[model samples]
Target chain A: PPPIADEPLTVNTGIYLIECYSLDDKAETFKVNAFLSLSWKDRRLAFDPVRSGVRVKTYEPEAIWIPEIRFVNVENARDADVVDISVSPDGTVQYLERFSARVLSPLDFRRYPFDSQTLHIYLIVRSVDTRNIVLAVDLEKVGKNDDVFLTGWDIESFTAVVKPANFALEDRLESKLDYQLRISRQYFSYIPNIILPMLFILFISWTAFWSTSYEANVTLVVSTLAAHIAFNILVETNLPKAPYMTYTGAIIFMIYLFYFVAVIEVTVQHYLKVESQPARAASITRASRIAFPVVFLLANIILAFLFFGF
Target chain B: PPPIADEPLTVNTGIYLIECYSLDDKAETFKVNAFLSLSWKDRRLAFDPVRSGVRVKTYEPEAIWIPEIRFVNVENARDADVVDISVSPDGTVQYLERFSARVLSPLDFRRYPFDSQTLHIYLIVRSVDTRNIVLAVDLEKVGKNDDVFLTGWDIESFTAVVKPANFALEDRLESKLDYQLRISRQYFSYIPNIILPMLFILFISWTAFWSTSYEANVTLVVSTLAAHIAFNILVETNLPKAPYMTYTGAIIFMIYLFYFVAVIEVTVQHYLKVESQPARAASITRASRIAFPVVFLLANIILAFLFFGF
Candidate 1:
């Protein structure tokens, strides 16, 4: 049995999630337990309370016509029982339903830590066509509650839209509405967990340029490069499989190239010294003290520009 | 009137569009002219065609129960007519409907030109519950035409799914079909019109590094900086308003710093000459030719690594 409609139910729906929970990048899904609230104009329930000295009527669910809308792509539908249904004398019907819905939401991790996602809850009317029902969303009421706190995401904004259902079948026309929850991720964790460690590794590799000892510099440079691999793996684990290169990938490779460049820098000076051009080798070592830091500073600025843009 | 199903029609549907038309980012709608194909098993239509020699029956548009499906965000429903219907002697039915559907598809332009979008068409059975009618999708047939060229986007992939509709009401359970058309933009024009010219301009400004004429180099560097600003404006105009800076923005800012750095290089050499140190001034000028190109090369590599990855 589907929810029956009486004289075109005009519904205003919104959502409030207790916690955003975890976002699985690999599976492209998000889990949430939310309360959906709907307020509609029910002409059938309208009563002149002033004449009868009665205000509102609260029903315990019987034969009343409710809008039969369904949330598409919900994985786990735990507890969809209605909380309450109250009808005011002015004909406004208020309804609430709470459920834990797991949705498969695909996302692009290119912008990644700097990214924001619009998680959509698509709802469709199953029993009524557009002619009998009108979905009018109150955008002002469609948002998260202030008490609800997200783990890694912040509520950037939320919006709702009422639109016609897109089906190729010409015989019937059903309308639907959806809520788009815009959430922006906090990148503060990346600075401590990823960015700082990688930057420290790159800085340690540069220390080889100033140190004149060939053996110590070589050992330091090679070891830092190997340790940086661990950092690369740490970042990779958090991201979805990417076809193209991302900003994070760029940083990892930059560390690899810096190790290669440092090796070449040391090898050239060592060759010059072995070949008996001690003056040139000494000058080269002296030159690197200023040259490496200056160019390294410039290189970092470019990398910063690349990763964070302007 | 919606399509009337005899004993509730269980349907498997798919659509292969000849051409997907304009996508309006501002209004969050996309138009598609497609041939929607559907197949179903109808027990009532069964007949022993081997005995009767009547293999199939063709019907006019009444009572055969086509799914009452609708485009949720249709802007202009110019044509939504069922083209043909055929019921095999074995009770299998095939139906075709041709329609130009405008769908409401909200997009996040956080990645903008570099982003891939999943344009969705949400369809639902308007009058049937899940107990009566179940919707399934033929994923193999849901796609776009190779002949139809997009202005900026190519079809990344196409997928479809059947899921239960989210209704606040408990009694009615209905199903729906949603198609995800993943598409990515070709940055071919950006490479030529935006990237190449900007790179050429940067190299041209680097001409200041090679030449010793201070006044001419300064003039050349400053004007090219101004000219590069014009290119930045051109690039910005094509893009949607973005919250974060992009790779393009990074490139433009890098060029600004290059000009600024070049000016300082020339000014330092000129001051060295005025302070009665021709040898030092000459050495500074020589250093500019080597240092600027080297660092400039490094800068370009960083940009490439950042944008294209290693």
Candidate 2:
């Protein structure tokens, strides 16, 4: 049977959680490997170069490159595909001493049928352009617990199957500012640290939701402000600078605006009282329903888009 | 002229550092390109097929898959020395990825003035792999003062120089384990959490050195041990299980062992005073000569290899 060139098609379009642990392949070595697991049905298949997309963390978070291939005798194809990685503090490119790898192709897959199909290929690579020295991958049998890749992130990929892998994503997506309502486990690790604290801020913002007197409102607002400052430091430490309001940052900013609203409410309450003594109690009660919620929420959204530009 | 044949050489000396940051690569709609700067001696040649390495990371610390390269295109003359990557999690194979790279034949580099016919190649690559993908390099061009990679780690195939590109390793040499180390600024993030604490342990050990004489030794040793227990807890919280005798763990262990040594010394001192009162003074006189410069210092050395097996 001819091989299927178009895979990853019609498959449930969920994100497959992938964890590339060790990218270690060198010349004369057998094959080095990594894992990508999906919660969906299609677990493994023969790797077709036509369908594979290579994304590398080579520069900024969002950049990648697709390479061309070539061959030297006993030598793999040119730009075949770099498969070995030595991540340490000192290893540098010293053609004579650096670790290297070699590749084998038309890759064969022994389709096994137990729970799901698995894919495995062995390889040998080298530092020199000469393919004489071969290195074999040292061991076998990877640990399942240690390798959990996110699969079925795209619902489309999962659509083919009866069950699509989906999960609650509001908290995580909002943090990165994507603002989508759904998420899957494929992006579980993608949750930025900011979301955790920002959600905490949201919880704290809810504390200010209850109708409280002017003085009470002011005090709580100030406390929330302080909490935000502490959390901003930590969140920034872990988060990337984003042009769009990240889901976590947006939520936190929204919470901050809420606290700001409380301050404004308290100020209005004081002003209404000072304006007239006779109807002070009436004005305070009316202000709660009329002035605060609508104006504050609107101002919050507008102001967020204005300065922070969420 | 034989067309130079280029032989089938597997160009497997690509080192990649995988990191997942929130860079929104997909958002930029960024287009990435990779160029392998091939330079031999003073002359440098460029190739169309980007012979650059791919970058990947563990899905999370707990998820582990060793990225590798294998090949099936052995019949294809261009892929004579190809290798592909087979990622397996648990005992089962999970997926197959394309990795093996090709080494371009010696190119011409006449730009710079150097002594020999050697040239440096820069595999410049940049890409927008995902909406928000980044790189995870543990160390940077800078020193080790910082351990965290904070500057934006994205899935980018930006400009990367295989530096000096003259590293030429042997094929199937008697020795194995030829590797390279890639580092970025983010590694500093581990310092305050990992290395700095070890420095403190070194100081505590040094502080205990003075207490060897008489009375104050017990208090100092006990305090040092207590400090380690607390520090150990902090280390555990921040870092996943470090190797049993990591640089951090071993340093902490040294403090504990010395503290126990203080217990033994106390008895020895007391015994000398009671059993050999005359020699007690003599023992004290030689104490500095016997243990001061040699024994304690040598102890630290042997202790290092004990834990890491490095």
Candidate 3:
């Protein structure tokens, strides 16, 4: 047995395959998975395990270690900054993958190996799965097969098959849409394109939190939500279609958060100042200096369609 | 060597795991495919290979045949209409599944082995991945690792994994919270709670479509979306508290599908209302009346949530 470095470098590059369903909701830019093969036109790739053990703080458990059998990692981001997971979501199993990344350099990279480098990624994901729980009349018990209530979602718990995706000619096509179809292709490596934009949209809409007038707060938030709906029509067209669900839809949810935040803000503002707490108003306006200097970013993102065309 | 019985009943059931991962997005609901498990749950199940076959109007090709695969009788009733799916959803794969009920001899069921009375399920997923395709990268020659854009997503693909829950231990945790907590306890079956609200809220929000309303046509839709956001707050308590990436929070999309339908309703009503043709209005109303009768049951499901506190 050999001990490899778990820490990731400041800059790492690799690729992987999701021959099944996937989404750009969280990890915006695709990275290289250990077993992932990146090849094109008779060329094979050795996915560089650039960052295996980087301290990437995640909402879900990052690395799950099962006895010698596997290492499962289910780390995904959602649109909801705050969610109540008291109940299970439909159609999905949640997981947390933990491990570290490093380059396998003991062997010759340029001399013996082909143009690409390959690294093996061993992982164990820790998570929950209720797919096996069926609740239907057919079984007189609930199970992944028999439950009507559980079958309506895409988020889920734990599972057995790690990658049924490898069964075929061993190919899953995800990056094509990101690289070619979507304009963000140039920044495929810059995950923030996927991450920051979504976060931007939600946090920006919190302008509802600033609007004092009900007519302004509700109407503006609702209208902004409506605009986002419009964007989805076009945005969805750019993204590849899949049978399973994606949290990218969560971006749309931020509208709700912003709207509610606006509602709360409006109510609080009203309680503090009816017509003009000139002082309340003055304090609010003064708070703006520190609360958000670039309030205009909200407007910019709202009009981002004009710039991004997506 | 063994001659199969002339008329035999097939059964397959159990908790099988479906693993999903995106080597890209961060904080994404990676696995413990939450939504897949829920949709395949029994109550909302509308999948009938035969019916899908009929819907697609295609015969089972070599792709669908296995050792003992056969299409006898299958049904899925919508209201009072019984529709046959000539092309089952899983018709593309070779499935050894049996889901039917028949009166057995007094001791048949009692004597039936655990494996004999379970529901067998198969998988056929469509994704986008391309690790082996000959594609392009910038400035580089046709190299083995050029398919950096290629990803792993199953597209119109088929694979079968058994979900046998009956023979496995029962998941009868008294508290829903405890049940959710237990996912982490299984070690292998642990998915973050972040994904639960994403699917549950999305699924429950879709239920509004079934509600019959004139004034509620649009407002109800928006309000329900808002309510879903509120429900999300409940799911947050269990999550590892942090302000970072999560698959559940990644897709904070503001637009919802129900909103689109509502908008269409408004456009048609506002721009194309008829003043003279009562017959057309009456016909449209009648169709809508029948179309929405399904909402009644959905309403009950929503009402049942008051007690979902369990």
Candidate 4:
């Protein structure tokens, strides 16, 4: 018998992610309990139901010619422990399966903790040629569990797209569906835990310029540098390697530059004192007490603008 | 008939990865061309291909009862383009298929540029009836590119493992096949592009202490800081966010400390000179020329040990 490739097999897909956990941006994979439902009408099967679509079955799925429905972006999955199949009076079949799947998502972390990313859940039909099958999405039922709060992210939006496969011809439409989940990072924790501590250490480093003694200032600057490095390691160490600089990294780099200037100003002050220019040494120190803070604050504001502003 | 719970349907699996590309570390997905072959001895059906398993027929696979084999870690895959089925005279049915797949891989980037990582390619059988299936891997046929030159990484090792799945019972043996790929980053580009520029900027910053004039010293110190920031933004902006201090970040931190000390030393020297302590100021300056370099080199050696040594 020749293969049938022209019959339109309409498949309605819906995905409701119960919860998202362990979003490993570095690995580009996330674990979730997704409720998947695919309903299609096939002339090969039928059932007489008095209700709208309340016909359930008690037969083994192996005994049927189930369409080859493939989760294109899932590498590991447990077969749904509870699967419900309902056949309407009109031969329309509804398949509902809830399973835990480690889904593959392409993520961009250039903005990092302040970045937003989208997760793509793709579905493809493998068996029964595209010409014999049609793919569609139940948009109303496609969503995430808003009750399950995510600590680091919030759902920004969602979009569903269906496209014909590259190999599909005008006559045979092999199709795919994508559930695009867009989420943006929540910044409260990062602002306090990572950025604030570094800023505090930088503030301490700047105070060295206000000290009366050069020895004390140098000693304090070294201590501040140590504090900065320790804080950086303690607070901000588990970030993925990205192709662009992060907002946090930018601030840290700026702090280092500011500290570098403070050390130089102190050194020059000492040279003036040694050259029998006490008033000049005193004047330079006094001026820097005001100037350094201004420069530091201005640099920080610029950094904030560059990263967070439009 | 009662179920056969004690004995598992032994299934053999083989995977030949022909090409691997688009290793997106951030997304944790890689694209590969793989040839998958599975075989099981079923006494239910036997075919005489010409004389033995040398020749196979072109028939629709759905007509025969083929065991459902799934790529356990591969989620996004096109239907196999070329599928062939051959049965030997001894009732050994072999199935060979070739397809492109975007495989999900869990990866760790703790050591990153200097770190070695392992990519896991796992395969599992998916049949819940008849005591399930036992998965075994063909080791001799499993391999990767030994000749292709990689830009950022080198193939370290490859190992194929067949192990019992977690759900295996005393009577029924459920198994999994794993193709483990170990690769290490090639640090040739990083050292020259990231490390060397940083080191050069630091070397110039250290030279500030040797300048005879205080103005020259201060101006040069500021320039060095600018150089450092410029170099970092230009080359090393997109580094992975690591919780611990990187080898390069450590060095940069130390450079700031040394510069901090330099600025204070000069400030103190000026005060001594103003107080008619010429000998003290001169001695301090003369001593620093040697002291600074020794300290810088020693700190770098220690940092190198911390990052590179065990």
Candidate 5:
């Protein structure tokens, strides 16, 4: 109960991350290990430190009535073990628990491997026992450990929204705190693995322009196209099926158009040579050698600018 | 102090992993969060449950003696927070702590993306007080949470060696326990990203065999060679520099030889044609069309068998 019955009980809360890992893009989830701290003033627990012979007295969780704090974005009830409970002489109750949970947070894969994300962990407390409860952020205890890490990611910062959102849910008032974890993907692997490889195959298909043999030209363009298809399928398998095309997805699909155009040019060149117009075929092939690479490079710059500029 | 002060104090220890992440290949390190439980009996802390009005009496950690447990493989002293201290009526003291640490462990990258690793967390207790101490594994508490996950990997099992190593060091006996976490890589992404793409480029370089035009053949062989060089550099950048070649590294280096030979064949064919030996040049080109792919396929089979068979 609050010191004044007319007012709501304010529970100051914070989370200190111990470990962060398993950011699954397909599942839209990330696992977190953290310490959840809660503080509130309980008038009934107050005592004189001199009389009690202790500045802070430890109490079992069973001996106190702590607010039931739950994670709104968690996949299930958080696995928590109460770490400690201490009551100050001024009747201030401090509670701490270490918990691990898989949080369901949506990601924007618009930029994909070059993407930055703000993952949210929502903490909520509902009004129960006919008493209203509100939440507040304690800045002092809201931080992550130095060793907290997520593989293949750079953790930027962890912070909480200063103000709590008080809203009605199921005919009860619920106070929610938004804790955000900012991170960016370590995209070095994608350069050699996806980007550079795709570009090399695209460039190989362009070698058809340098040839006059129709059999060799068709083989060059068609075989590289088949390889490009395999590469595209392989890449798509690694990413989740998204409603909108990602930056990498756009580039991958764009390369297919380049392959198709190269095939068309190869077909046209063969037909022109068969019609006894060798001069026309020669000029077109010469023009395409420069045209293909320049257009490809320009399109990539545009796509990168569009995605990264904003 | 031991119950009789005559026998070596046996401290049973167990670790229940809460989170595991950050397996850095280059750094050869991993991060872990776990509950470390230690149990020992002390005659001085004995009491009757009925007299204390409790079955398990909770005591402040400062009010009792706890073992100085340390991790031998950790980068530094572990960050630990005492969770609870409870005493049974028979003077059995149970201590629990939640700790996070960066563990130093060696990894074998011989198989790399297809590799399975056995990571170790070594627990140790040193004899500092002259009273001999020993360590034992408590099987009941030695396990991991169901939600424990490592991104890009599949965790097989977390277990501890039953026997503890007791060795004398600097005139003191130290007891150590080996806790092992076995895991394997999820190699699906590597198949599409590295393996297939590299094969496609190698096959593309062989297109020179089908051409008679020296210019087109040089463009085919040399351009694809350059692309292969870029791809190889990109691939090597993602992996740590290992003294021994990885399965993928061997294949990558092997392809460079294929590209060099393709250049040699292209060079010889051009020189032979210039020397007015059309019959000899034609025969060599025809023979190489089948020779390159067959030799490549057979060599790949031998390499795969050598790496994976034994």
Candidate 6:
């Protein structure tokens, strides 16, 4: 507690990230190791600089009254080891601890592969004692190590909200601070792996439109349909099951519709050829040659606009 | 020098990796930051603990004689900063430095995408002084940081060979050490990106065998050939140029032969159909529908065996 009874204790806080790894999209969790810093003034511990013989005095964590700080969205209680605790001549207590935790952060996969995310880490302190404690951000100490690298992501920035969110919970006031880590997916491999390969498969299926032989047309459309199914399965296996449709998911499902319609056209062509209307079958095949590709290009443009335009 | 003039000085060496990054396949190089530890006994530095008031003493690196350590496979001189140099009561000297360097390690792309590589870092000390200095490994200190990770690779192990290679160079005996880093590629994305997509394109070209229309056959076979060319171009752009053909390269080149033969089959079928021998043309097409698929599958199996079966 501070010397004044009516005033709230201000605990300045900061986090310096050391390592960022194991970003699992399916589980929506990420692991992080960092140094947490907390500072507060306690006037009772003050001493004269001349009498102390030292500018700073070290103390064990158990020897002082420290705030009970905890993470709000962690999977479990953070594994923390106190690094150092020092008191200045004016009794400004500086606390540092190295901690590792798996954070439960939600991710938006609507765009996916090309998406950028801002991950959140919440720091909170409950007013369990008679005096309320308010949390604050120490901008100088809020930074990440230069070597902090995430395996498949480009880390943009690490920042914090200076203002704390104070609210009542169970008839007690609690102060919370928001720390953000911004990152974007490394999408270079996705172009060669997903986008181009999918487009090539779709184009191969369209070759059915330029043929009149029912046997060849059926084999072309159906074999490619099987290949597309295999591709879709492979893709879905790598991504999490999202309730809302993603851009890639929409494109893949739309390709299934194209395959189904190609089957209908093949059946219609064979039926007309058998009923002594060879001219009608040829006419339908010729029109389909241009219609299929045109519609596909237009549909892709609409999809891309819907996802990326704004 | 040792207290005995006739004896050679033995220096213990160890390396603990801190950061690993910038693994450029094209350059065949990787950057590493590590702590280099060296220890040796020198009687001149010994002290009596009772008189010194401390069990150990620290000294600046400039005040002591350190063996000139260098890397054999490095691109340039390593950037190093001395972390600490401590002297024990028994005259044992403990030296530590943190260094960063780009190592010139060769990679074997012959089995690329499915390849495992052993990268090496060669540590050497030249016997420049009158006393011949020998190097020994400190097994307990030879390790890597737990958070050490390379993007797009799974690091298996880091170990140093026990026997130091002692050889004479420029009238001086040099002691060398081999530090090996074993890693394997993360090849999950390659299957969907390269293998299955290429197979689908090749299979689409085979649909021409069931068709009698020369125009449709030409469109099917040639259009898919063009698609194959684009796929090949995309793949080559991502890989470094190698003198010998890789496993993926062999598969890609083999597809070109299949496409060339498909073109010839289309030409021969048209010639037979126009010569008023429709039965002969139909016979060749029927045989080819089975022949093409069987040959493709068999060739792929043989290639797979050649690359991985041993």
Best candidate per TM-score, number?
Answer: 5
Q: Residues A110-215, candidate 5: write the lDDT tens digits.
A: 8987899999999888886545454556553456756565766789988888788888888888888888999988876555455655565576567656557677
Off by over 4 Å in 2: A1-183, A186-215, A228-238, A271-285, A289-310, B1-36, B39-310
Whichever of 4 and 5 has more DockQ, that candidate is: 5
Tens digits of per-residue lDDT for model 3, B1-310:
1112233212221211222223111221222211111111111122554533233222222422222211111122101101111233442221211122111111111111110112112222111221111111111111111111112232122122222111111332110000010110111101112233334334433332332233433553465467446434533433334454332332333224434554565435433334554455445545544454345335435433432322
Q: Lowest summed-lDDT stretch of 10 residues in model 6 chain B?
A: B132-141
Candidate 3 CAPRI category: incorrect
Stretches > 4 Å off in candidate 6: A1-111, A114-310, B1-6, B130-142
RMSD of 3: 26.3
- In candidate 1 the C-alpha lDDT for residue A14 amounts to 66
Sort all candidates by TM-score, best to worst. Answer: 5, 6, 4, 1, 2, 3
Interface RMSD of 2: 19.8
DockQ of 5: 0.08
Which sections of candidate 5 miss by over 4 Å? Answer: A1-6, A129-142, B1-37, B41-310
**A168-240 in candidate 4: lDDT tens per residue?**
4111234567777788988787667767777777777777766666556655654565566555444333644
RMSD of 1: 17.9
Q: lDDT tens string, model 4, B1-310?
A: 2123356666676665544555765666666555567776655455665654334333357655566665668666445643455555556666666566677887655454566778877766554666555455655345453322222456776667666464454555445667787777665544433454356446546655534455555655565666556545543454545556666666666877876787788778777878887788878888987988898789878877776785
Docking class of 2: incorrect
TM-score of chain B of 4: 0.78
lDDT of each: 0.63, 0.30, 0.28, 0.62, 0.76, 0.76
Tens-digit lDDT track of model 1 for B133-202: 4455655255564544333467777667666454433556555667777878664434333454455546
* CAPRI class assigned to model 5: incorrect
Better of 3 and 5 by TM-score: 5
- Top-down lDDT ranking: 6, 5, 1, 4, 2, 3
Ranking of all predicted structures according to DockQ, beginning with the best and ending with the worst:
5, 4, 2, 1, 3, 6
What is the two-chain DockQ of model 2? 0.05
Q: TM-score (0 to 1) for chain A, all models? A: 0.77, 0.34, 0.26, 0.83, 0.94, 0.94
Preferred candidate (DockQ higher): 3 or 5: 5
Clashing pairs in 5: none
